[PDB]
Amino acid sequence: GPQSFVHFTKQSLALIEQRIAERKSKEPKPSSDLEAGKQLPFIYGDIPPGMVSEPLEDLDPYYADKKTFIVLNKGKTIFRFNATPALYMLSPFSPLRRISIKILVHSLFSMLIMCTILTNCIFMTMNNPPDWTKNVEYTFTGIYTFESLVKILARGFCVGEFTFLRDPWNWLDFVVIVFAYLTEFVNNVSALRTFRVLRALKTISVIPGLKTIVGALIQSVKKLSDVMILTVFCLSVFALIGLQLFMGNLKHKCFRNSLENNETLESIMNTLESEEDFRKYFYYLEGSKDALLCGFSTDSGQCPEGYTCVKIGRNPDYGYTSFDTFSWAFLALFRLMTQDYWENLYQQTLRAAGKTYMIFFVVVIFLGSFYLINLILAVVAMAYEEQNQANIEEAKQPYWIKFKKCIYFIVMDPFVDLAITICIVLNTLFMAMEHHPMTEEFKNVLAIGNLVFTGIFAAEMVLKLIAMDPYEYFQVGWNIFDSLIVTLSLVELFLLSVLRSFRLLRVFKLAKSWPTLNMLIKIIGNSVGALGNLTLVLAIIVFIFAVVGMQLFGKSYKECVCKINDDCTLPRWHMNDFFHSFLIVFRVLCGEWIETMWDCMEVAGQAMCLIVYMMVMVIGNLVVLNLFLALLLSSFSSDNLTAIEEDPDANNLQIAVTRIKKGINYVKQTLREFILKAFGKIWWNIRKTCYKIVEHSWFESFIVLMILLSSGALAFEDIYIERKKTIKIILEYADKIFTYIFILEMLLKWIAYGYKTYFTNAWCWLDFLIVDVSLVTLVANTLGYSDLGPIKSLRTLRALRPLRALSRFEGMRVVVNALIGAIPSIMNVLLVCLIFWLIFSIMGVNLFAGKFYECINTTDGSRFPASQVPNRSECFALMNVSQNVRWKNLKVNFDNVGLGYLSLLQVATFKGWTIIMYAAVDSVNVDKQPKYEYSLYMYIYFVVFIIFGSFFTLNLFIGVIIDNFNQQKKKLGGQDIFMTEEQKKYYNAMKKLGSKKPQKPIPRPGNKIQGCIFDLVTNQAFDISIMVLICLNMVTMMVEKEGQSQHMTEVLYWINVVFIILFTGECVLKLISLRHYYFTVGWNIFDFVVVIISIVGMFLADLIETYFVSPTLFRVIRLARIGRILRLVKGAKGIRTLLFALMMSLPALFNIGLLLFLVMFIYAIFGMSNFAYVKKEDGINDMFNFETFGNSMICLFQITTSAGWDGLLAPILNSKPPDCDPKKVHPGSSVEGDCGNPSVGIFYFVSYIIISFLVVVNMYIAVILENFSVATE
């Protein structure tokens, strides 16, 4: 009722006094719809004029027993105050109190505070401020203290409820004000400035809607406790394994064999300090900061002649890359799990230890780096869906008219829209025809075409504006968009490169007729629509992190600059100013945090840099992942509500195509009319026996074995096959026999099935094609045409022989069926990605076409400073004088749209993007020598592209793929689409292990001492003691480090032997207590196995280090101690569920891995065939190349995660001198030349990374998601 708006008065106070007296004699829940900060219930209607911003009776009957009142604000919001006098001095009926209440409730107060905070956040971004900013900071402090004073005067300081200090954000305000006054009067300056960044967090308080977003984020982070515990445990176990295996291995260096003056390694190492001094005794590669790593095994790195391998010195990367201590091993394993620059650690460890140690990296990458990340993603996804479901549930609970009509007839016809769409596509295709070495006539024709197109669009704009009045024209967002584009085009015509690229946004007008391209617009609009608050929180967090990093480390980056750069100049990535600090933070969010953190540590301390970087990583990735999953789920779930019919008013394009097909039918009918007016019993048994033989298990097994043998025989064709002549001859005759076998099988299948049944089958078609290629090759070799051009090139298609196992193996055929089913949506989203990336490719061409050329010293690879050689003419003039000068260009650049596509792919995958960014920010002009960071703010182009393409395009891709998989599963009838029928039974039986009720307790024995031991051993105290003993053993295993004393080694050995005795004794006690009932529990028999393995491993290690010399075997055997610490899973129910989810997802991951191995094998054979002789450059070195099956598989496993593929592709882009030598002679082979094939290389690498993305990411996510929900169910 509107009469409840009574003023808070003395009679009200007396009534509250009598009610509190009754409450004292007396020795529920407040209304949620009336709670402060919300709008009044609609039952109360409108506020009468006389009671706004005045003390009113507490509208909630709940507070009728307490001295609390309500002040109402214009805009219908409720602030709940306290009627107790403020500071025990100022009663609620005071002029100061009423004025303060009015000031606080006014909206202009909040507006002023928001403006003040946003203005102060601009002054925060100054590395060194002018001397006059002291007045501005005094003004800011005065405004803040006035706001805090008015709050305290209005609502009391800390006297009872609803006071100033009762709000947690007021704590931050008070801390800010006291810090400001303290640093102003009492006076580390850097720490105080970093505390000044706390005034940015008041944006959350003053901006409405951010407080709830922050609360939701905190509630979401509360849901990740089990996943974080499991992640830490897994990283600790893997770090212990790595510490056991690779301890001290990264300190291997190649040392001089011949020393003068009786000097020894200790004598040399006691005197050297500088890298120039070290380079005289250890082998350094050219332009390297670290000594080359070597190894003592046959498969490790090789020292040059005259150099010997020795363990001495410091670890690479300023000494930060190592497995020497548990802390460094943990850092390395966290780096591996996040896959940040992990290929460098991969190659370093392989070079230092051996190539058989890639199994460790395979296990780590496929067990932690993917499974833990997918678990985190799944848990955050469920947290968001529960939050969203709760939100949905709560929401549920005279002469001019002639021309006007004529042009309305003309310009609104459905054919006009089709013509305009055709013009848009033609204009985009015409703009995509720009390249760097463009002749003047081509430039002229492009200019004329663009002029014609903008004229056409402007004419359409004028016709549509004269067909209907602007009052009706400007009512549609599409017309507003086109109006902006046309007016910008006219402005540019009257007057750049950017405004020329602005017209490219017209391609989005196809979203009306393109259902999938509308999804991209929906995602982008949601990012600034429903989720605008999440985006704003992300932006605020990034700003705060950039400012904090700059304030903490900017001066250090400038003082200690010679520690991180030889020239004593600031590196490419630093935190000396705001823009570069923001770039570092954005790069960390992209996922590159270790290379910059090394320099951070070098300049300003490990502790500080580690703390800041870990905070940035955790919080930024939490918020980014939350936004990503929110966008995905909202756009692909909430948009599906059947709002409006499918094109109720048909689009003009649809009407145009309907009229076109009607006219086509009419023309066809008229033309047809006009032209008509003008003018044996044994053969069936033979087929039956062929079918009986072909369909037999013996035949199938024999053919499968032959397939495996013929596929494995392809791995022997290395570059080392000229040394194996017996194997060469054997493999040739084996090829002949295999061809005969498969021809016979194909003939038998023909006779058994029939031509129609055989040829209406894709597997049979694949087999037929492979055997045809083999037969053609055999015939050509027999006729002597073994080297006839294309015939010789047809021999590289023998790498497709392994493709015959897909039909044979049910798990690979099961996975390929899902891929084939998902192909159409993949094509749709790929087309959308191409259309979206064409805009950025054309813009990049317009910006950087022909500006990546530079004049370099080839000996050093160093660009000449532009003071000398400022252009290509001077570069040539200098080349005529010197001999090692070259006017070089980047291999991957923006010289045309085709190369811009490759540049965009490298930028979006974050592999090789730094070179392109450096060239772009150095670019000056065409035929001009680049200058260092001349175009500094070209980084914004890459930031904007990374966001819009790499983030939103990936969101769309994942959404479409998982939707396709869900639709396939629904079509199958809720059946798993990655598991075989045999695996379904195992899965169903295995699923019942997560719900079996506890069995009957083991009965007590008969013997008295046995019963007493039973009571001792069946105790929670016993279990807890065992758990703490396991933790202590884990700590003793963590303590061990590199270079430790023999005394510490002995004491650690004795401690571990004591732990072994304790665990064996507890196992014996449990055995003698439970009799034979002990072996009825899986965990009990696991403990039994672990005890036996521990004892056997200790004895074997002691034997191998006493009567034998084998450090590698000793290290591998000593891995049996991890079993004693794997037992912490038993008493951890949170992580046991996640491990059960992993166990549940194993069968499908096995099939996916089988298919991945087959694809990797095929690509490896192709790589050895093609890229075995390319020049050793960039990522192709003496150890990681395509010269052997093992090397090729190592490289392919490396780039399965899309790591270093740019550096492997770079040596293959050489096709002409002086990059390569087409007539190079390789000793021991008849192959000539070390040039690459750019087209083959590009196809190879792009296709492999696309396949890897479509398998190892998308199927992994789907399987982990469904099985985590099941394990959770």
Binding site: S556, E559, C560, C562, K563, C568, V603
Partner: protein, 119 residues
């Protein structure tokens, strides 16, 4: 390059004076590369007398106006380059300057102390 020196140092006649000259360069003080140039001038416009230096070891030129009363009292390895002075005479009143260069740093610092003799 930051050098911390007292603007005015007042000592009594017949007492010992320690001249505080310190710096906080980021890099380690390489004794094979450190450069020190201690100079004394009777006034700001007066010429400077070169009397103490570090090149590879602390070398004291032993000027007649200082006799054998000038020795080294700091430690370059801990960034103190202070110079001691026994029994400060009234003639010792003046301006003392310490110049420090510490490769691989580029900036060159300078610290100035005005020594005053009290009665």
């Amino acid at each position: 390059m930051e050098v911390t020196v007292p603007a005015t140092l007042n000592v009594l006649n017949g007492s010992d004076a320690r001249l505080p000259c310190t710096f906080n360069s980021c890099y380690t003080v390489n004794h094979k590369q450190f450069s020190l140039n201690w100079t004394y001038q009777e006034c700001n416009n007066c010429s400077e007398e070169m009397f103490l230096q570090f090149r590879m070891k602390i070398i004291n030129l032993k000027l007649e106006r200082f006799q054998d009363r000038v020795e080294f009292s700091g430690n370059p390895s801990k960034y103190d380059v202070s110079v001691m002075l026994r029994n400060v005479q009234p003639e010792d009143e003046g301006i003392y300057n310490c110049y420090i260069m510490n490769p691989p740093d580029r900036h060159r610092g300078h610290g100035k102390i005005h020594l005053q003799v009290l009665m």
